[PDB]
Amino acid sequence: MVQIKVYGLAEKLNPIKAELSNILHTSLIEVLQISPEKRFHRFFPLDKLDFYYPSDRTDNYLIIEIIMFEGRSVETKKQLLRDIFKKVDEKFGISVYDIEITLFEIPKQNWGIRGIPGDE
Amino acid sequence: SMVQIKVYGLAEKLNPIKAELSNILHTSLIEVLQISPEKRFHRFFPLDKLDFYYPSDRTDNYLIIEIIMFEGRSVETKKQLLRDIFKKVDEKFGISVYDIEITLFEIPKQNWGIRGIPGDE
Amino acid sequence: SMVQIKVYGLAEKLNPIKAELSNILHTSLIEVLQISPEKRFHRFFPLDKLDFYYPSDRTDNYLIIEIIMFEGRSVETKKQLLRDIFKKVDEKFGISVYDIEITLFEIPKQNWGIRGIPGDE
Amino acid sequence: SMVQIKVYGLAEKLNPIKAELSNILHTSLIEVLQISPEKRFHRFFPLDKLDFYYPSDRTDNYLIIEIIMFEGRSVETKKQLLRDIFKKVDEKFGISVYDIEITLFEIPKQNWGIRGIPGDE
């Protein structure tokens, strides 16, 4: 159970989002071992009047929010962060200074999945 | 008691139901959490086909509900909220429980500003 | 240190003020949290009328401000942040504090990846 | 479920009453948390005069009660427990509520090993 929400400038995000989704899924499969069937991504292509970022970021700026169960080690979480940075760099040439990632951890019992609370 | 709901789904599916979905979720919250019937705070996010990826074993009725609320309720009450929403949405709209995902985010009251004041006040 | 702001409101009311509102909110974070004046990260979500339900005692000026930030600040600093935002948006726009809601989401530094590394490094 | 109580007080005041304080505390948890009446887990820590410093406004009847339990109970319930302990200890022992201090530590279930297994199992 991992949800990704990806935000970026529409003009830049729309051309890459289909391959970006594949890349982020690969990266979760590899580092966290989710099932390949369980891709849950949402994209928010933003109008330029709706997205403010500092002058040392380009229009390629991506914010990647990952919502996930509590319980993974700090080391796994850090590896996930570095792997996403490396893979988006490799695939698209977007600088690490233009990528931001935030992990939101949720206790299992706070998540309803397939009709039941996540801890059941 | 302050509760925000955010709901996401494929625009095609969500837009025809959202008015009635809102009523059903709000009733759910009145009955399980005993919130004030006046206090409905909902935001809907209809998504373009190309912006919404859900599992390949599931369908385009995939519906995501995020609820943001004050800390302090029991685990039993929260579990009963999840089971009520799953039940009422399945029955009202014929959306399978495998196509519903619900996530609760609890916020300490001092972290929320409401009507000019922090929530613990 | 990293502060991300997400602001929601009715499109008709939010669209004409959002640029200025961005300025005012950033000023408030500079003053209360002493973040770098360079480090403005804001996203706006102007909503269709049909996608936004709020109570009868809010008007159509209702703004929800979600602030995502590193844990580690005191309760008194965070409360001060909430009050400064209420005061500044009210003084600048005449939007009543009853129409303004602020929620703080605190995240451990190590859960945040910035410039290629985890926030605690 | 699992509730551990630890009680600390001056030896000369605690030792005469600890058998009965143990019964009072357990009745309170039975009534308020609805734990099984079999499941009493109590430890007492009678302290030497020179090992216990408390404020001058307080008397040598000062008792500290630490309760370790599973996370998952409502704030209303935890507050009912606090109120119940104060009242019953005051009534039974003539110890003033100013001379009683109670702290609760909540532990997630998966962090507690009980009868050979993790608590969430």
Place this chain on the structure above:
Amino acid sequence: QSMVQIKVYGLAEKLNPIKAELSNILHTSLIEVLQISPEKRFHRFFPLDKLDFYYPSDRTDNYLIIEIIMFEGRSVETKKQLLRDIFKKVDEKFGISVYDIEITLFEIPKQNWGIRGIPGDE
């Protein structure tokens, strides 16, 4: 580099004869599961008088409570693995039923712990 403090509570008459060997067993478990340095043993023992120790009737006088204070950051699986290894090793060495053993993990953010003159996150 990991700080792990263990606090161990049992009936004095039962705990006193075994505490020395129990300290070794518990350390070995932490080294094997958490991979702490073998020179970083921090244990406190609280042998209790009979009248200071109540437990249910389905626990015997061998009842042992092990409180483990440690840094946040380990996975749930590693933590459960620590619980199961402690259960098993204490039973195997001393003949104490796993039913007589209780363990509680207390996780502390690193910045809330001062070690060797500095905050643990430094």
Place this chain on the structure above:
Amino acid sequence: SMVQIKVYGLAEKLNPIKAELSNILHTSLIEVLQISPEKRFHRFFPLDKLDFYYPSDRTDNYLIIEIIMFEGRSVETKKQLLRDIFKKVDEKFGISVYDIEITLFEIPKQNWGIRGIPGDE
């Protein structure tokens, strides 16, 4: 606002210093956390040599200071508290900072009962 201190050390070494160490610790809490000078709550646990194991790069002066307090202070203030304790104790007693260990246990105010009522009230 409320702070409890528990101090563990080898009885031979702790007993002769405890009374002055209490003064030194309370001074540090007054100065860094601004607690009331009246509100000293300290428990000492002089341990037998067979009940205290520590590594061979700690001496028999090894002190474990457990501090239980309200949540809500900044990381910067808690770190100052740690630094001040290290300094004052090394200065006053000639114990190396390498022999001093401090652990802060933060508790929601609503998880504490004081003078009959929850700490958030």
